[PDB]
Amino acid sequence: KLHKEPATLIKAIDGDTVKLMYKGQPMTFRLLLVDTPETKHPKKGVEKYGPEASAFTKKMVENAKKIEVEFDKGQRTDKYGRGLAYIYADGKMVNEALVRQGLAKVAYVYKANNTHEQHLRKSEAQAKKEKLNIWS
Q: Which residues bind Ca(2+)?
């Protein structure tokens, strides 16, 4: 089953992307099962709530004492070379926190990487009941 591995923060890039030192090598990680408003969107400019999601992720990983990555069962890298994982800051999954705060939507499953989809779905449901940020 899944297991967490240590990593070291290098730089927070976007609400859904963080650069980390994983096993002695820098890597860009794309947070699994989440879709945050972008600030660095190819087409379309700084989307609504983009700055908020970026600040949220940034704050969470920078203030953490221990960063851990957790790959799922499917493909572990996307077509851009970004690792696909669940990121944890001091035991708290950053993917879930974003959703729970209404700063991200739960994305489509990417090649069998859906172990935590149900959990995330529940948090997203709650965030919309509470009309949080995106769900206003």
A: 16, 35-36
Burial class (CB in 10 A: 0-12, 13-18, 19+), 65: exposed
57 marked as part of a ligand binding site? no
Q: Which CATH class is domain 1-136?
A: mainly beta
- Contact predicate 9/62, CB 8 Å: yes
Q: How far apart are CA 114 and CA 79, in angstroms?
A: 18
User: What are the catalytic residues?
Assistant: 30, 38, 82
Q: Which residues pair with 21 in a beta bridge?
A: 8, 26
Amino acid letter for position 14: D
Secondary structure (DSSP) of 21-37: EETTEEEEEEETT-BPP
Distance separating alpha carbons of residues 55 and 25, to the nearest angstrom: 25
